Write a protein that binds this ligand. Sequence first.
Ligand SMILES: *[C@H](c1[nH]c(/C=C2\NC(=O)C(CC)=C2C)c(C)c1CCC(=O)O)c1[nH]c(C[C@H]2NC(=O)C(C)=C2[C@@H](*)C)c(C)c1CCC(=O)O
Ligand SMILES: *[C@H](c1[nH]c(/C=C2\NC(=O)C(CC)=C2C)c(C)c1CCC(=O)O)c1[nH]c(C[C@H]2NC(=O)C(C)=C2[C@@H](*)C)c(C)c1CCC(=O)O
Ligand SMILES: [Mg+2]
Ligand SMILES: [Mg+2]
Ligand SMILES: [Mg+2]
Ligand SMILES: [Mg+2]
Lengths: 150, 150
Amino acid sequence: SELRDRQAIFETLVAKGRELLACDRVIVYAFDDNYVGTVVAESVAEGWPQARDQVIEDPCFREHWVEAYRQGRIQATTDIFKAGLTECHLNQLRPLKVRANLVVPMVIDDQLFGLLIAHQASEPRQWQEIEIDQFSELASTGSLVLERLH
Amino acid sequence: SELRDRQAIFETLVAKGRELLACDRVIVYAFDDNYVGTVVAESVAEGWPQARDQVIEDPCFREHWVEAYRQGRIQATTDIFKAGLTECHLNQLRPLKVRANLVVPMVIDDQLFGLLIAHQASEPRQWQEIEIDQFSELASTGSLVLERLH
Ligand SMILES: *[C@H](c1[nH]c(/C=C2\NC(=O)C(CC)=C2C)c(C)c1CCC(=O)O)c1[nH]c(C[C@H]2NC(=O)C(C)=C2[C@@H](*)C)c(C)c1CCC(=O)O
Ligand SMILES: *[C@H](c1[nH]c(/C=C2\NC(=O)C(CC)=C2C)c(C)c1CCC(=O)O)c1[nH]c(C[C@H]2NC(=O)C(C)=C2[C@@H](*)C)c(C)c1CCC(=O)O
Ligand SMILES: [Mg+2]
Ligand SMILES: [Mg+2]
Ligand SMILES: [Mg+2]
Ligand SMILES: [Mg+2]
């Protein structure tokens, strides 16, 4: 089925993504038609909370970032507590122990299907250029495969 | 269909591989139980023979290297004519046009499914660490996709 195919690619991306970065969590944050996100796949190291299957109603993608991510925006944050973020934003990340994160888009048929997101937990992390390139390329490869499968 | 899904992934791998390396050819070379390989997908630049749909039996894999490739062996060759190769090896490459090559494994369910192979056809080419890493990760990601998809 189309749903089984997407999930297989998503499980591949989170597993390979966490291996590539040796970070604490990688997820696929998939959007519904109103850009409400569901954590549909997760690779997470031992001891950290599981984000899998959580629904996170974060309005900034629908309201502000859909176009930039469609166009290939990448967001990397070394220290979420030093990024000018509001408490509402921080309270989504605190339970998952996020301290640093890297966000790349999954664009399929020119549409923003979701985000591949890496977390460093309870520890800041400066994401390096070639790490970002490898992670962006992983998301693109996965997205291109899904484009070709159907 | 496993076969149709397969071909879609292979086509993504060869196209992305040739884009990443800007080389003359990238192929997927898939093994059967004699460890005879078939070129099952190809991206090739203008002017070079199409290696697509070639069955090429090379005994060195089954005789020496299958397990090593399972474990992540590569072949990086800057100039095949300075590599101490036999006429039988040179003869099997001559119709394709290979001057330099990069061979990385595709491992699925802990077996050597095939090789992802890049060719430079009219000049030597010293394959760089970053290229080897990118090409290896491409092959690994595509392999894991196939492993999970069915
Ligand atoms: C936009 C925004 N949200 C996120 C969300 C996540 N990062 C993660 O790691 C995860 C997985 C746990 C999620 C989910 C990011 C990365 C961004 C930034 C996008 C970018 O710059 O490219 C955002 N959301 C909020 C939430 C806040 N705003 C509201 O109106 C309400 C209500 C909120 C509470 C739920 C904020 C403050 C931002 C950033 C500011 C902005 O760009 O508008
Ligand atoms: C082993 C060997 N063969 C290949 C084959 C290919 N390179 C490519 O680019 C392609 C696609 C067109 C193929 C197919 C490689 C890369 C290697 C090296 C493996 C390694 O060390 O990792 C090899 N095969 C031969 C051929 C020769 N030996 C025979 O018994 C018969 C028969 C032959 C003629 C068909 C040779 C000389 C080698 C290298 C030495 C060895 O590994 O035994
Ligand atoms: Mg199917
Ligand atoms: Mg690495
Ligand atoms: Mg399509
Ligand atoms: Mg399987």
